[PDB]
């Protein structure tokens, strides 16, 4: 054997074991989710409070790309940052040449091709992150999830990390119970609940909630962080549901 020692090597199955090993690093990471709504998207993430010494609200994990796209990820945090840095370069060169801000499907492929490129050679390592991202463009709202292999699809809801299965189950219920659609302000509240429910799979250390959102009506199509009263309102909603 030895097929798993090098990246870009096909096993006799037709599999790239190095990419599958990168997925294990993603599964080890904290829970992050994405919820598509009526006129936008909502992102949320679990931040494990390792110590009292961590400054609250000052270790921001969700990242903005351009002014209209939000990105969140689970797994190796530095690898995620590298991917977002690339995303920003891709989005900048698109706007430079074509004037209009990069569409979300267009942006999704730019990351997809970049991550896929890191499965082509043995001189590079696959990305150790699954990235949930999306935003609002001319064609409306889009939510995507990108994996170490370079595989991505559009999603109604998306989840990844240690509590992905708990979050996926909770996401599936929302899709069933809301066929006509979910509102932006509702999706923020739901996002909080799902993170709190997904925290049951990581309950040794207590955690800190972080939410962001893009909405055509609520945020005027731009990416913003949920803070202050709207954040505390979402936390209280989540606290009430676990009890």
């Amino acid at each position: 054997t030895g097929y798993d020692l090098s990246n870009s090597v096909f096993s006799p199955d037709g599999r790239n074991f190095q990419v599958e090993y990168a997925v294990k690093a993603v599964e080890n990471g904290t829970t992050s989710i994405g919820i598509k709504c009526n006129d936008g998207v909502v992102f949320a993430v679990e931040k494990l409070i390792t110590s009292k010494l961590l400054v609250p609200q000052k270790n921001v994990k969700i990242q903005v790309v351009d002014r209209h796209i939000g990105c969140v990820y689970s797994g190796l945090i530095p690898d995620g940052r590298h991917l977002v840095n690339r995303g920003r370069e891709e989005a900048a060169s698109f706007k430079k040449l074509y004037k209009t801000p990069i569409p979300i499907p267009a942006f999704a492929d730019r990351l997809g091709q970049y991550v896929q490129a890191h499965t082509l050679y043995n001189s590079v390592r696959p990305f150790g992150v699954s990235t949930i991202f999306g935003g609002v463009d001319k064609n409306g709202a889009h939510l995507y999830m990108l994996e170490p292999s370079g595989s991505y699809w559009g999603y109604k809801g998306a989840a990844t990390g240690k509590g992905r299965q708990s979050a996926k189950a909770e996401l599936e219920k929302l899709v069933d119970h809301h066929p006509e659609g979910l509102s932006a302000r509702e999706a923020v509240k739901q996002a909080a609940k799902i993170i709190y429910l997904a925290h049951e799979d990581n309950k040794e250390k207590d955690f800190e909630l972080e939410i962001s959102w893009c909405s055509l009506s609520e945020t005027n199509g731009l990416h913003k962080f949920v803070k202050g009263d709207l954040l505390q309102e979402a936390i209280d909603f989540a606290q009430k549901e676990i009890n």
Partner: protein
């Protein structure tokens, strides 16, 4: 085992062993402590010597008038990273006439360390850094790890037996955070914190190394007879 030959290889459980071995170099390094209030930020570092005839390895490096760090692990790697920080702080000043934010400083270090963990041939940095600074949003303390992970904290410690000082700061959190407009008392708290990581050896005049930055205080380092006050 079979997956630790280079940084480009993942283990079956999704681990990067070369990055973990680089992390191990920090644990062997001498203890250093970081802590801050709202007005000032302090670095305290236990320096290490080869023998009685040798000097004590300098742990603290200045990056700008408002920023600097302490190191633990491979000193040459700290020199490379601190030099990079000096250039980035300097680029921010020349081009934008703007003091570099301590948060951006961390982001830049994270991205520089990351590139070394995804490419063949290179190696991870073998050093941990505690960056302190005072910028437009007040005092700051960062912890850099060569995996790429940077974390903003009220207080922390890295190196050998750093758990003792880290526990102390976790207890003292409410006290030292409110030491505002009083440099000497914030240092005292940091010196008492690093003392919880000592075994058999005590803090002497050419052993202790302290640095401070704050509201009306540029980043300055204290060594020799200047730290005799705090023993």
């Amino acid at each position: 085992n079979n997956y630790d030959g280079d940084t480009v290889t993942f283990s079956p459980t999704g681990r990067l062993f070369q990055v973990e071995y680089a992390l191990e170099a920090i644990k062997q390094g001498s203890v250093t402590v970081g802590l801050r209030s709202n007005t000032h930020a302090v670095l305290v570092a236990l320096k290490r010597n080869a023998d009685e005839l040798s000097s004590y390895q300098k742990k603290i490096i200045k990056c700008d008038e408002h920023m600097g760090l302490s190191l633990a692990g491979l000193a040459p790697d700290a020199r490379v990273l601190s030099n990079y920080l000096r250039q980035q702080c300097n680029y921010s000043s020349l081009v934008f006439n703007r003091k570099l934010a301590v948060e951006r400083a961390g982001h830049l270090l994270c991205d520089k360390a990351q590139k070394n963990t995804q490419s063949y041939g290179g190696r991870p940095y073998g050093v941990g850094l505690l960056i302190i600074g005072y910028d437009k949003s007040g005092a700051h303390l960062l912890e850099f790890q060569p995996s790429g992970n940077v974390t903003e904290l009220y207080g922390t410690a890295i190196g050998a037996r750093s758990q003792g000082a880290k526990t102390y700061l976790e207890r003292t959190l409410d006290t030292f955070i409110k030491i505002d407009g009083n440099p000497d008392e914030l240092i005292k708290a940091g010196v008492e914190a690093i003392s919880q990581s000592l075994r058999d050896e005590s803090l002497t005049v050419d052993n202790l190394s302290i640095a401070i930055v704050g509201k009306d205080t540029p980043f300055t380092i204290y060594d020799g007879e200047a730290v005799a006050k705090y023993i």
